[PDB]
Enzyme design. Structure first.
Site, short mmCIF file in Angstrom:
data_model
loop_
_atom_site.label_atom_id
_atom_site.label_comp_id
_atom_site.label_asym_id
_atom_site.label_seq_id
_atom_site.Cartn_x
_atom_site.Cartn_y
_atom_site.Cartn_z
N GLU A 1 3.95 0.20 -6.06
CA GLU A 1 4.37 1.53 -6.35
C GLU A 1 5.92 1.57 -6.90
O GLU A 1 6.78 2.19 -6.46
CB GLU A 1 4.31 2.52 -5.15
CG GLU A 1 3.26 2.41 -4.39
CD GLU A 1 2.94 3.41 -3.19
OE1 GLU A 1 4.00 4.15 -2.67
OE2 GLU A 1 1.84 3.25 -2.53
N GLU B 1 0.90 2.35 5.24
CA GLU B 1 1.98 2.27 5.81
C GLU B 1 1.71 2.23 7.33
O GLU B 1 2.18 2.97 8.20
CB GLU B 1 2.81 3.60 5.70
CG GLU B 1 3.30 3.65 4.13
CD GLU B 1 3.77 4.75 3.50
OE1 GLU B 1 3.90 5.59 4.42
OE2 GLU B 1 3.90 4.94 2.31
#
Ligand SMILES: [Ca+2]
Ligand SMILES: [Ca+2]
Length: 364
Positions: free
Chosen positions: A257, A159
């Protein structure tokens, strides 16, 4: 709808490969039955795995029956391997790797670093810059070497678009250092960026520029993870569009995810089918992982699960199982071998001769 018909065409186009080879019963040449059954998919249909796999045999059995790839939900993050400075533990992650190895389930590594401050060990957040780097140095070298050859993939720095804990202290050159030095310690590992709001939201152009900047800086980014945390609805057309934009970098893309939240399992199933069918139909995508499955242990709770608390499927789990059945090559043919077949490995019978048919070539 039109999107499903085009998706299915690209699936036949990109996920399969016609089959034909050997066939001689000591020099016979024109009849017999031939059974063509797929035993492993090349394409990843995986899931996040958490602590339940260590004490919940029902969870463990469910995992092995539904997922050919795994990733650990927490047990390889930095705070979990070094909960206190200098107190290093990998036992839980090593146990989960042994479970995966004995079932021949490849594992993604998640994640050496995470750029978001709120995801990092709290002892790191009061240290001066050079001590933070010394802890980073040991993390990368100690965990990079411990897991050498155990993970097919690394989320190297999770991220990076949505944090600044390390960038603020060392500049974007610390990111080149993360990827470069992981590549040297573990060349076999495919190195990922991994980030959210890219297919679930419209940050795909920012991500593309972000991958570009990382590579022009010298960082060996080899693959693109998009997390696929959706909210309430999955639009397949926009997802295909946003994937299209990312595919221009020429790098493999993984949905890492996947989940969505909806009280009505029916719409949950529709969301799941929408993402999986579109992802499976995109030639740049190589795998999908679900971020959990069981209502007893899902980071977004029961309204995101495909299997209820009592281990009965809901409509989303059923739809997931039917998608897997739909995308499995099981054929009996008399015919001297002809059928398209999804990439993977095959038992061909006249269960006798197991054979591989991968995707390196496109011609039979
Ligand atoms: Ca843990
Ligand atoms: Ca996303």
């Amino acid at each position: 709808q039109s999107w499903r018909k085009e998706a299915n065409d690209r699936i036949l186009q990109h996920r399969q490969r016609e089959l034909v080879i050997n066939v001689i019963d000591k020099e016979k040449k024109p009849g017999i039955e031939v059974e063509i059954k797929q035993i492993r998919h090349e394409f990843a249909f995986g899931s996040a795995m958490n602590d339940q796999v260590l004490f919940n045999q029902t969870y463990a059995d469910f995992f092995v029956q539904h997922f050919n790839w795994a990733v650990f939900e927490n047990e390889a993050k930095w705070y979990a391997n070094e909960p206190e400075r200098g107190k290093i533990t990998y036992e839980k992650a090593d146990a989960m790797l042994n479970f995966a190895n004995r079932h021949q389930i490849p594992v993604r590594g998640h994640a050496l670093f995470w750029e978001v401050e709120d995801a990092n060990p709290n002892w790191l957040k009061s240290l001066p810059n050079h001590e933070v780097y010394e802890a980073m140095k040991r993390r990368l070298e100690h965990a990079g070497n411990h897991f050498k050859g155990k993970f097919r993939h690394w989320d190297v720095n999770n991220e990076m678009m949505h944090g600044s804990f390390f960038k603020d202290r060392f500049g974007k050159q610390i990111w080149k250092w993360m990827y470069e030095e992981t590549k040297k310690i573990d060349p076999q590992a495919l190195l990922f960026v991994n980030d959210y709001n890219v297919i679930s939201y419209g940050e795909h152009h920012a991500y593309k520029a972000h991958i570009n900047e990382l590579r022009q800086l010298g960082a060996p980014v080899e693959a693109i993870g998009v997390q696929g945390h959706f909210a309430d609805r999955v639009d397949p057309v926009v997802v295909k569009e946003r994937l299209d934009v990312l595919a221009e970098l020429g790098l493999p893309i993984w949905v890492t995810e996947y989940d969505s939240v909806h009280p009505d399992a029916n719409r949950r199933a529709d969301n799941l089918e929408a993402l999986y069918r579109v992802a499976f139909s995109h030639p740049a995508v190589k795998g999908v992982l679900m971020w959990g499955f069981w209502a007893g242990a899902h980071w977004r709770g029961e309204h995101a699960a495909i299997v209820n608390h009592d281990w009965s499927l809901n409509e989303a789990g059923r739809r997931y199982e039917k998608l897997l059945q739909e995308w499995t090559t099981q054929r009996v043919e008399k015919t001297q071998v002809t059928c398209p077949a999804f990439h993977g490995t095959y038992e061909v019978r006249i269960e006798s001769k197991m054979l591989q048919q991968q995707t390196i070539e496109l011609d039979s």
